[PDB]
Amino acid sequence: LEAQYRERERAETEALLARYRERAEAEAKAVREKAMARLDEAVALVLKEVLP
Amino acid sequence: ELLVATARTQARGEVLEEVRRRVREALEALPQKPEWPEVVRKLALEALEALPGAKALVANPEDLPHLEAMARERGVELEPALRLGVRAVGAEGKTQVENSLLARMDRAWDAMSSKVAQALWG
Amino acid sequence: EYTGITYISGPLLFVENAKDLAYGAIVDIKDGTGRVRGGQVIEVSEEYAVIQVFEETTGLDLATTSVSLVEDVARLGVSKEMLGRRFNGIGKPIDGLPPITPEKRLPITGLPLNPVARRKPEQFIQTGISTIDVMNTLVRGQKLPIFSGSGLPANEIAAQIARQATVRPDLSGEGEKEEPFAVVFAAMGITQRELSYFIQEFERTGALSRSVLFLNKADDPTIERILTPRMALTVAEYLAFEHDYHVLVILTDMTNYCEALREIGAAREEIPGRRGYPGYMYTDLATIYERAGVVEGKKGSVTQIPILSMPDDDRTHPIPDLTGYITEGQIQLSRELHRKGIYPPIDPLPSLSRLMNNGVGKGKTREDHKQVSDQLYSAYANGVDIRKLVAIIGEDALTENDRRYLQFADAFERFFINQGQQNRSIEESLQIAWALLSMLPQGELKRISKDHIGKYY
Amino acid sequence: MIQGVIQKIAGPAVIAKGMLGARMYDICKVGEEGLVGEIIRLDGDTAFVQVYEDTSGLKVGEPVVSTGLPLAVELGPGMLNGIYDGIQRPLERIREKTGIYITRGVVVHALDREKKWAWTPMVKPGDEVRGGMVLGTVPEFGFTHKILVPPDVRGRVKEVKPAGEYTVEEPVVVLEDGTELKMYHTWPVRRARPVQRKLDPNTPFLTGMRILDVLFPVAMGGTAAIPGPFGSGKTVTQQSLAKWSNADVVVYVGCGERGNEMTDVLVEFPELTDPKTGGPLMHRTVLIANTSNMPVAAREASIYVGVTIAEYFRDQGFSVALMADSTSRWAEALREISSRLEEMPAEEGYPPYLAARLAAFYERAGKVITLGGEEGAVTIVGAVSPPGGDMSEPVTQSTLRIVGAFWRLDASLAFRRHFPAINWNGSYSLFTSALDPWYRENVAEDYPELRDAISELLQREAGLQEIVQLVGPDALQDAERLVIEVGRIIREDFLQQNAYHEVDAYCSMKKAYGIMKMILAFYKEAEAAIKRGVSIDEILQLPVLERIGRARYVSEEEFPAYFEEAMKEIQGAFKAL
């Protein structure tokens, strides 16, 4: 019983991780794509506070 | 959950250090720009106004053209060797407050790290 | 520059031109080794200051004595992304996430809790154990010290209870979502094994994506020792009061914390104290512990559990005395118990928690609990009186009552005190107590009412 | 270079002047003979000279010209086989060029400069180096002694001198970084060979005893201590690490141990057999010991300098055994600094530097995976004593009692027939719960069962000890005198071991296994003997009492068949009655 429950759990502790990876990477992209448009604005705020 | 944190931090990094790449490219080609006197003069202003008494407001010698005016307001200017800063030296000893575009850049992701995160993401 | 270098013997430094510097400041020192080092600026004057270098003292030269002002004001981030990371020391990359997250540059000490903004305990936590949650309720914002010995491993019996501890306010009608399990840990001066044995427990089963470590190695300088707590201290305020989370601060090894401190104070012209340990301890030790206690309108507050070492739990030096005024209760460790492998080892009459019924009531930890909690005190304590005397009173006088009280003990230490690393709740930790007492007659039960007996036996 | 002469000569608190471009904690030359000092203060132009070799006529107006290294250790061959100091000088050479005397102002070599060792090319100018890469394999006697590049020192090779012997001063590999890799090269001890991380031990180390391995295990990668107040037979546990250890490479160091206690120990070892070879024990031992005969300042340096010599072999792929012989000798040097510098130590007879310069050496190495990805494991068995006579003092608890094992000792303990002694009660083991795998597999699969069941009696006996010093037990009962007499023989024959014979000590798996089951069994059989009504008097006057009495005069070799015959005499003279 334990024998058919250990392999069960193994295949679920693979399924769970597999989905986490897909969100993680898509939400990694969502932090890239959000920045690269509001990118010149950051450089502006930085520049403006180094040169005084 | 750890995997989410790591893949985001990795993504977030690339953007901060590339922002740094664009910012440092601008400072490297700063002398080329005609906005070079306005910057140099304001940096040395806080310096002489601060802890260095202006014994000598030591500069690089090709930024001596672009600060010879405020040599005549304070100090005698003769280098850091970066060509992108101004050391100031005081009459206390030598004192030593160096306001470099490099030095203000290094402490501005540890001194106004908040401000760049708000402008990219919020 | 910042010359005027006199008495550089060990990590002392005097420098003149400290009219630009502040107390409570930290500065970059430059030298020709190429090492850039900190160390706090203490005992300042218009001339001579005292700086104590971040790392060692090997590199200081006479050529370059300049100091790049970092900031007179004390800078300290308040973080909010630190709820599932790993760090050792001040905050250095172990898991490769960045030290801290800025919001503010708050000082290290902003000054503790205002007393009229503090409310009574009214909730409890559960550490997965029996004897220290049934017999003595660990309440809301309680400050409960665990006096450990020397020659015994403090550190293991600590983190053991890490995974076991998952809170259970179930019985009161609140979840573990309104009481989250946040382990914020700050040790100092810990061994190379023990520092890796800590992270092992965490990484075992899921509990490191809801907790942060900080632990200043016994080879990380005595200057960094002190600030280690103050860091996560100021972050903690913002965790449990302003996110409504519930943190549990577990400190370990206080001896190191207090040794290093002494060196610092001895150069500010403060005399050390009784049995060499400092007398300016009191103030400084307060500030870590007094950010404990509930807060009006803010449900989440930090529970404090400090752990410290003594030679045999003797009270003949400062380390317990001091502590023992601001903190409530003590829970000392038995040689008998720990030999036999009964964990965690908690004494009979020597052990008691000052509060245990003003954070819990009836039906919040069960109703029978009331009188069950003062049974097993008087009921356990009776077997300890013949737990070795069975042949010192010969076989020439032997009685039924006390004999049965030997068998009580053996099953009380096996089953009740120790429960392995297996998890328990209030209701399962209560089961054990009743069952064992069932051997015993009704005539040896006296601290529990017939009402409670008419519920469970 | 650095200038200056003596301003104020005043024995060992000398104040130089004119010191410019000096730097803290750096080796120098002072005087006209050269006594070898260290900058332990700077105060502008003036610097506190620390004076190692004794002053005898040194004056005002003598050189103080700073070498400019921070006690840098010359890495390279010559170490294996020899007598060295804790800041590195070979006592072979001092004795060979002076007398039998040690003359002050006579500084001999840093390592070698007249010895040559065979170079085998193993790098070419085509490839690059990294830190913790083999440059070649030099053969020093029966051991194998490579050369490595220290870490943070790296380049791209540019030559490699061909096969042949070469003097150690010279290079043999040169790099395109302005550095040249030598068989005599300065490396700081202030930045002693970096590692990848601290790891948890889980493989035990063995001294070949039945009390330092059995009831309270020691670890490989470990830390331990065995305090024995004001001497108590704590020096004898190095006649047990002498030729019964499993350390591939021994590195024996003493802070400044007094000559007489290392007269018989010091020359005992070249005479001794080498278990890792056969000849002198000095094929594996390095011996970097510092004595009272050696400089009084050298004692202060000693530990933080001698750590780096432990590390160079440990890095390569060795399971080095480092022992600081009585760390209290280091405390007497550390606290003397105050006296000479006009500062008071930390109050109540405690040293000013507590944690700072103690804990850091200890935790510098001990089961740590390296940068090369090799396993560096330093095993120490601290042979300490308490400085105040009390063990409630900081330095004891902070790294000498939060250690992996503690064994207490008394004075009348060791006098009976115990050397090295351990207490029966007062000895606990702080790490054993990670050393059980290895014991189970390698030794015996029921071994964590058989040590907990011996200790159980050994320590519960304390229960009775208290009632003695109370009213006293006078109720002689069978279950009474059962514990009493059992435990007694355990202290009389099993804690009484001599590190002087190979039949009273020296243990391998089957001997350590065997003895520990011998007792258990007899005890076991006594439990059910007495229960029927067989008096303890008649148990005592059996010949089987004498067999346990003849289980400390039996060799390891014989041990196998000895035990196999005696298991029958147990079951015969017990069950039957």
Automatic annotation (TrEMBL), chain A:
It comes from the Bacteria. Keywords: Coiled coil. The keyword Coiled coil applies. This is V-type ATPase subunit. The keyword Coiled coil applies. It comes from Thermus thermophilus (strain ATCC BAA-163 / DSM 7039 / HB27).
